[PDB]
């Protein structure tokens, strides 16, 4: 139910950094970042219209750690919801607990944050939530529970976090290891070389 294999392969295939490692290292010193995996990585894909749509959807999925079934269901919900579907898809992803745990800096990666969640190290409103896809709401307070507070992963995670751009819609107290999901992120909060409308196109045909 989770992708467990090599991670930089995914970045290499999509042509971009997917933040699947902590960021302690320039990614180009860990892999040949600008070349696809495999014997024929140097080869260029003269890539069909379907192809660009597929790869964009894969990219987003691989960023958030979501497999097809759940992600399709995410599209369905984005569509049902009011307002722009493409933007609704990203709101839903960005509201996941494993994700939010990552953005408050409690985990070096979404993979690490997910493990924190699954392993009962995260509370929401002082209540233990251990499922990664838990949808987090405005004004919620997610926190590292007392016993998980001395984990060195978390301190390192918060350090790296302090060096990333700081997300607007979250208020994080690094000392308490608690943080507040102030509001749903706008579209403008999220990276601009994500092409949701391509993903929207892939799932309407």
Partner RNA sequence: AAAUUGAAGAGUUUGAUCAUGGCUCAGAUUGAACGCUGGCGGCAGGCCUAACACAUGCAAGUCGAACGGUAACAGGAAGAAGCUUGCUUCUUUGCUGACGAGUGGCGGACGGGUGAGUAAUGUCUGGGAAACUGCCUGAUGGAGGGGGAUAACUACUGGAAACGGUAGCUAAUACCGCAUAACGUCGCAAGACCAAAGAGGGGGACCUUCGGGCCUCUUGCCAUCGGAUGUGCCCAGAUGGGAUUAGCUAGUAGGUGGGGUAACGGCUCACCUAGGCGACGAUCCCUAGCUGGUCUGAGAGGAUGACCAGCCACACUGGAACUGAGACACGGUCCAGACUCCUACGGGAGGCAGCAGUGGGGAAUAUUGCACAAUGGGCGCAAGCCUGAUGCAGCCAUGCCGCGUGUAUGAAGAAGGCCUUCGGGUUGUAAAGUACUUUCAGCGGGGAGGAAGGGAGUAAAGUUAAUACCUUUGCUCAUUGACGUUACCCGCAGAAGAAGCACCGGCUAACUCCGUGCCAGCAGCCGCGGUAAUACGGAGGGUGCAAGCGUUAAUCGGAAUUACUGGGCGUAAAGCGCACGCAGGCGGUUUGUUAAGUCAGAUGUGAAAUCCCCGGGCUCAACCUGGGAACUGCAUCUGAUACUGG
Residue carrying the six token digits 């139910």: 1
Q: Which is nearer to RNA, 2 or 168 (CB)?
A: 2
Residue 96 near residue 73 (C-beta atoms within 8 A) = no
Stretch that binds RNA, among 33-41, 87-95, 169-177, 181-189 (CB under 7 A): 33-41
User: From CA 96, how far away is CA 43, in angstroms rounded?
Assistant: 37
205 binds RNA (CB under 7 A): yes
69 binds RNA (CB under 7 A): yes
Select the residue interacting with RNA from 18, 75, 91, 134 (CB under 7 A). Answer: 134
Chain positions 78 to 117 lying near RNA, rule: CB under 7 A, are: 80, 82, 107-109, 111-112, 114-117
Residue 180 near residue 143 (C-beta atoms within 8 A) = no
Query: In this structure, what token pair is assigned to residue 141?
Result: 């307070």
Size of the site for RNA (CB under 7 A): 78
Please, what is the minimum distance in Å from the beta carbon of residue 58 to RNA? 4
48 binds RNA (CB under 7 A): yes
Select the residue interacting with RNA from 149, 153, 182, 184 (CB under 7 A). Answer: 153
Residue 130, burial from CB neighbour count under 10 angstroms (0-12, 13-18, 19+): middle
Q: Which is nearer to RNA, 169 or 201 (CB)?
A: 201
- Between the alpha carbon of residue 119 and those of residues 60, 122, 130, 131, 187, the distances in Å are 25, 8, 7, 9, 31
6 binds RNA (CB under 7 A): yes
């Amino acid at each position: 139910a989770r992708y467990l294999g090599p991670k930089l392969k995914l970045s290499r295939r999509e042509g971009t950094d997917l933040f699947l490692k902590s960021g302690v290292r320039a990614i180009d010193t860990k892999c040949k970042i600008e070349q696809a995996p495999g014997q024929h990585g140097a080869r260029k894909p003269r890539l069909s219209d379907y192809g660009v749509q597929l790869r964009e959807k894969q990219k987003v999925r691989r960023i958030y750690g979501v497999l097809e079934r759940q992600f399709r269901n995410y599209y369905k919900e984005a569509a049902r919801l009011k307002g722009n579907t493409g933007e609704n898809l990203l709101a839903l992803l960005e509201g996941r607990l494993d994700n939010v745990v990552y953005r408050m800096g409690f985990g070096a990666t979404r993979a690490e944050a997910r493990q924190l969640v699954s392993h009962k190290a995260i509370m929401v409103n002082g209540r233990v939530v251990n499922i990664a896809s838990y949808q987090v709401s405005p004004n919620d307070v997610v926190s590292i529970r007392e016993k998980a507070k001395k984990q060195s992963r978390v301190k390192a995670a918060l350090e790296l976090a302090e060096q990333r751009e700081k997300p607007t819609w979250l208020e994080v107290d690094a000392g308490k290891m608690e943080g507040t999901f102030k509001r749903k992120p706008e579209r403008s909060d999220l990276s601009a070389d994500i092409n949701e409308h391509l993903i929207v196109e892939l799932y309407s045909k």
